[PDB]
Amino acid sequence: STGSATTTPIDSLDDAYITPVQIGTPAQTLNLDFDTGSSDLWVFSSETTASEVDGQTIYTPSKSTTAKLLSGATWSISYGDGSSSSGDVYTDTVSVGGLTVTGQAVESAKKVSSSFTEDSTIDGLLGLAFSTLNTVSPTQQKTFFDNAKASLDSPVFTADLGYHAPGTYNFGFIDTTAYTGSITYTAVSTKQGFWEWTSTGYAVGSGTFKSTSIDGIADTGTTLLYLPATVVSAYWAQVSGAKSSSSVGGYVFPCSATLPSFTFGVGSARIVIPGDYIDFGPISTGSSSCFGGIQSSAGIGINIFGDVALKAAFVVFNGATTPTLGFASK
Numbered sequence: 001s002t003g004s005a006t007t008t009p010i011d012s013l014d015d016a017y018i019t020p021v022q023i024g025t026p027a028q029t030l031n032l033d034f035d036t037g038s039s040d041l042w043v044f045s046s047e048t049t050a051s052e053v054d055g056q057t058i059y060t061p062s063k064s065t066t067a068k069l070l071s072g073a074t075w076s077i078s079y080g081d082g083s084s085s086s087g088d089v090y091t092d093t094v095s096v097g098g099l100t101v102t103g104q105a106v107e108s109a110k111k112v113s114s115s116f117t118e119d120s121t122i123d124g125l126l127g128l129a130f131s132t133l134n135t136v137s138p139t140q141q142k143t144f145f146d147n148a149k150a151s152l153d154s155p156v157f158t159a160d161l162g163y164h165a166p167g168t169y170n171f172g173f174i175d176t177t178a179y180t181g182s183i184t185y186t187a188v189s190t191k192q193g194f195w196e197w198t199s200t201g202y203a204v205g206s207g208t209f210k211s212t213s214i215d216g217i218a219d220t221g222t223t224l225l226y227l228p229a230t231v232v233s234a235y236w237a238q239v240s241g242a243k244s245s246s247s248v249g250g251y252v253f254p255c256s257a258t259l260p261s262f263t264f265g266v267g268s269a270r271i272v273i274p275g276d277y278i279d280f281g282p283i284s285t286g287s288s289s290c291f292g293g294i295q296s297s298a299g300i301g302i303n304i305f306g307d308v309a310l311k312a313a314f315v316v317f318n319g320a321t322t323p324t325l326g327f328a329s330k
Ligand SMILES: CC(=O)N[C@H](CCc1ccccc1)C(=O)O
Pocket: 184, 185, 186, 187, 188, 266, 267, 268, 322, 324
């Protein structure tokens, strides 16, 4: 089997991407944030505290003939941005882009933090990291991908995120029309439960490539590119008037600037992030300080190849027994 679903930016900055997901019988379609940095499929629901719902579509298990309470199971998750959610668990039928899993754990939110409430466009998350990170207790649950894996034509999914445009998540096949040149595969560690790999270095604009190992995660659920402070300082040093602002909490730059590209290495291959991908717009409405898309990881504890980096590539998440990542230009 395979599946193929379009993923759409939630706003004009590509802050996140939503993908429609069918849950239950008859189908209830919710728009979920597919997150390769977490392992819970959770949704706004008929159980979510009413004051914490503001415009989201909710899953109502009582209206699904295939929903079953997973008795005694609870979940609670905290993300890198400080947001959180928690609740109880149902099993139900979940379909993405024509690919169906029966008995998927659908984590129903009783509580969500303010950042989720305030984002009316995201109805929940679909985690695509390794199932070792799943937060369901006392019986950990599998991701949609791990449940689908044995049924797929090939044990893979691909992320093809758009720049200010829709893109695609495919499951079970690699669309050879969706990328240029060849795909370069690189090793993954699952030791922390993430799609963790080591980039071979970077370049700023038309500068020389610096060969240096940068260990980080491929995370579709993070907007920006978070790299070591040395690398980030070298990038922003090429933008007149750019500075790190502890008031704003990152590098900002004059909105009048033209940004240089940023290249990262995947083995001997190179992925180029155009400068425009690194512009996240005025910090507050009407400001001429713009927020940067490359930020320091020094206050995180891990480097994160978020959407700024991933949307410059066609990315293969290869979940064979020995997982790998692949990157192609597009
Ligand atoms: C150095 C690099 O970019 N790739 C190699 C092979 C990665 C690999 C492993 C198994 C099957 C296909 C590919 C590596 O990271 O060890």
